[PDB]
């Protein structure tokens, strides 16, 4: 039995808001995405995941949805969504949409009804509780600042919001609510959608009675919110009432969950989700407060990958990504975005990304080696989470505005959201108007038109790696083995299938390094290298590596 198409595919994530504008309002749209499908096809992309594209007041850029069955006004009409689908299908490409059902907009008609009275039939579509001892029902905090509880004077109770005030949590404990969600999913799957990605999938079940978080839990609240006791019962039911009747792949954003629980979401025998996005790697260097960085080494990086791979085992399956719309840019985060090293390290990270056991997701603009943005003031951020940090840390006197700026510049989601850099015309060819978020000035050196025409570019290297992955089954579905998990200079591992073995070797230092193959192993062939003056000789038992050198080798 061949493995399903999604185990061997290469995905690309599109953040439609920041991808391509076609009417000069400074916001990307569907017509912009549709016009650029030949660009993604030519790169070799099999499937696209688009961030939320539904009716939204955009307090959280699409993740506050006010109608699940209509398209966002800024992106276009249902006709434009249908045309997008038809053009993907022409190119043999698939669509994964984002599914945001932990919470809705406070502007959704369900919520406008829910708020009206305790006896409203929509009351229990959300969570409403009396406050305690003069204040909120409990001490839950929100990821976006202040309490996770908001008082509504219309009834005098509080409603739950893990995310923003304008994102009330949906009440999965209510059967009528679940049934409404399942019908909504069927609405999109009936249109032929090939995949669904579940935003914060691990927080759907709430703790009965909502007791206070202990001081430990408080310091790690993201984790406590993943511990609802009905979580897997809900996911199994969603599979039985929705996914079982379609041919779609399902991927969960398992944010906050302890790694050893991940198998419950993805083990195929459990009939929950097909694949996981986990955050142990991408947050391995993030403080608990989410706005400081802690220094880590390559040893921490590879050890995390190893543990994550082990949790997928025989019946589970992982995605692999180094960036998304909620994190800093891959090259700035994991490589070295200084001008002399940006290109060399962007290539090394590509090699890593495209040779992991798992379905790779390439975040828009990483194929160009786009970097973090040079924020100068707090006013340069759009992000609602940065306003939250301002509220929780600056106004309470815990940190100065400057301490916030300096640290959040490195970590903020807005680093990923600056407009895609198409060429060196005005605003990098993203828009003819004023972009909703400023273009990085480095667009003059980093842009698609320049990259595409250059066979030594980062783009070209990504295109070649993708082609090599497509051609070499061991690189998608073969086993993974880290050759030396404690080495903090040179990342090396094998991928193996049906007697064939490939060796990947990646120098994480901006300094020359040596690598000795394990005993009995010799180089048979060189598939590709980055930043290398010469391939090893057939039979080679060791390698000399330039700074940031990467390579893939068939081994014997």
Ligand X SMILES: OC[C@H]1O[C@H](O)[C@H](O)[C@@H](O)[C@@H]1O
Interface ranges with ligand X (CB under 6 A): 143, 200, 222, 255-256, 326, 385
Q: Print the SS3 string covering 163-177.
A: CCCCCCEECCCCHHH
Q: How many whole angstroms separate alpha carbon 450 and alpha carbon 428?
A: 11
Q: Is 29 annotated as a binding residue?
A: yes
Q: Is 96 helix (H, G, I), strand (E, B) or coil?
A: strand
Listed in sequence order, the DSSP H helices in 135-290 are 175-189, 215-219, 221-224, 231-241, 263-266
Classify the phi-psi angles of 550: left when phi > 0, otherwise alpha if psi is within -120 to 50, otherwise beta: beta
Give the helix, strand, coil percentages of the chain, each rounded to 5. 35, 20, 50
Q: Which phi and psi angles does 52 have, rounded to 5°?
A: -55, 135
- Determine whether the annotation assigns residue 152 to a binding site: no
According to CB under 5 A, which one of 7, 8, 25, 113 is a site residue for Ca ion? 25
Judged by CB, which is closer to ligand X: 219, or 434?
219
Q: Is 432 in the site for Ca ion (CB under 5 A)?
A: no
Active-site choice (253, 326, 367, 414): 253
Identity of the residue, 252 or 369, whose beta carbon is nearer to ligand X in the bound complex: 252
Catalytic residue of the set 64, 98, 199, 451: 199
254 assigned ligand-binding residue: no
Sign of CA dihedral 264, 269, 274, 275: positive
Q: Minimum distance between the CB of residue 450 and Ca ion, rounded to whole angstroms?
A: 24
Question: Quick one: which segment of 18-26, 42-50, 328-336, 489-497 binds Ca ion (CB under 5 A)?
Answer: 18-26
Applying CB under 5 A, does 419 fall inside the site for Ca ion? no
Q: Decide whether 128 or 255 has the Cβ nearer to ligand X.
A: 255
When asked if residue 23 is in the footprint of Ca ion (CB under 5 A), the reply is yes
Quick check: 80 binds Ca ion (CB under 5 A)? no
The distance of closest approach from Cβ of residue 362 to ligand X in the complex, given in angstroms and rounded to an integer, is 18
Active site residue 253: yes
Positions in 28-47 near Ca ion (CB under 5 A): 29
Concerning whether 199 is annotated as a catalytic residue, the answer is yes
209-238: string of b/e by CB count within 10 Å (b at 16+)? Answer: ebeebeeebeeebbbbbbbbeebbebbebb
In the complex, what is the shortest distance from the CB of residue 371 to ligand X, in angstroms, rounded to a whole number? Answer: 20
Angle among Cα 151, 156, 160 to the nearest 5 degrees reads: 40
**Among 320, 397, 401, which Cα is nearest to 362's?**
320
Task: Report how far residue 269's alpha carbon sits from residue 254's, in angstroms, rounded to the nearest whole number.
Answer: 18
The yes or no reply on residue 21 touching Ca ion (CB under 5 A) is: yes
Residue 200's binding partner out of Ca ion, ligand X, none, with CB under 5 to 8 Å set by partner kind:
ligand X
Binding-site sequence positions for Ca(2+): 21, 23, 25, 27, 29
> Which residues make up the interface to Ca ion (CB under 5 A)?
21, 23, 25, 27, 29
The set of catalytic residues is 199, 253
Annotated binding-site positions: 21, 23, 25, 27, 29
């Amino acid at each position: 039995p061949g493995a399903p198409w999604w185990k061997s595919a290469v995905f690309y994530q599109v953040y439609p808001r920041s991808f391509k504008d076609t009417n000069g309002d400074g916001i990307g749209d569907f017509k912009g995405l549709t016009e650029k499908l030949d660009y993604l096809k030519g790169l070799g992309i099999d499937a696209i995941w688009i961030n939320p594209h539904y009716a939204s007041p955009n307090t959280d850029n699409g993740y506050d949805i006010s109608d699940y069955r209509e398209v966002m006004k800024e992106y276009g009409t249902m006709e434009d969504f249908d045309r997008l689908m038809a053009e993907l299908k022409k190119r043999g490409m698939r669509l994964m949409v984002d599914v945001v059902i932990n919470h809705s907009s406070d502007q959704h008609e369900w919520f406008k009804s829910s708020r009206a009275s305790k006896d409203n039939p929509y009351r229990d579509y959300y969570f409403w509780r009396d406050g305690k001892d003069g204040h909120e029902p409990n001490n839950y905090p929100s990821f976006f600042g202040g309490s996770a509880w908001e008082k509504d004077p219309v009834t005098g109770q509080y409603y739950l919001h893990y995310l923003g005030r304008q994102q009330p949590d949906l009440n999965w404990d209510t059967p009528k609510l679940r049934e409404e969600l399942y019908a909504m999913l069927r609405f999109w799957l009936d249109k032929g959608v090939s995949g669904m990605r579940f935003d914060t999938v691990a927080t759907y079940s709430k703790t009965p009675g909502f007791p206070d978080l202990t001081p430990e839990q408080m310091k790690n609240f993201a984790e406590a919110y993943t511990q609802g006791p009905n979580l897997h019962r809900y996911l199994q039911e969603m599979h039985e009432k929705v996914f079982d009747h379609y041919d779609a792949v399902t991927a969960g954003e398992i944010f906050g969950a302890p790694l050893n629980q991940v198998p419950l979401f993805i083990d195929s025998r459990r009939k929950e989700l097909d694949m996981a996005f986990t955050f142990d790697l991408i947050r391995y260097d993030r403080a608990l407060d989410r706005w400081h960085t802690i220094p880590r080494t390559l040893a921490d990086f590879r050890q995390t990958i190893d543990k994550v791979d082990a949790i997928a085992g025989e019946y589970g399956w992982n995605t692999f990504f180094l960036g998304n719309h909620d994190n800093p840019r891959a090259v700035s985060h994991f490589g070295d975005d200084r001008p002399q090293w940006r290109e060399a390290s962007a290539k090394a990270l590509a090699t890593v990304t495209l040779t992991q056991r798992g379905t790779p997701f390439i975040f828009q603009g990483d194929e160009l080696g786009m970097t973090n943005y040079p924020f100068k003031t707090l006013q340069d951020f759009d992000d609602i989470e940065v306003k939250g940090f301002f509220q929780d840390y600056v106004e309470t006197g815990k940190a100065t505005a400057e301490e916030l700026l300096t640290n959040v510049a490195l970590t903020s989601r807005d680093n990923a959201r600056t407009p895609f850099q198409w060429d060196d015309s005005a605003n990098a060819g993203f828009t003819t108007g004023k972009p909703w978020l400023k273009v990085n000035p480095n667009y003059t050196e980093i842009n698609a038109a320049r990259e595409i025409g250059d066979p030594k570019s980062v783009y070209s290297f990504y295109r070649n790696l993708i082609s090599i992955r497509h051609e070499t089954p061991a690189l998608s579905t073969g086993s993974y083995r880290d050759i030396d998990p404690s080495n903090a200079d040179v990342y090396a591992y094998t991928r193996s299938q049906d007697g064939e073995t490939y060796l990947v070797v990646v120098n994480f230092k901006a300094e020359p390094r040596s690598f000795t193959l394990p005993d009995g192993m010799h180089i048979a062939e060189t598939l590709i290298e980055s930043s290398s003056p010469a391939a090893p000789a057939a039979g080679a038992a060791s390698l000399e590596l330039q700074p940031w050198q990467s390579g893939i080798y068939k081994v014997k």
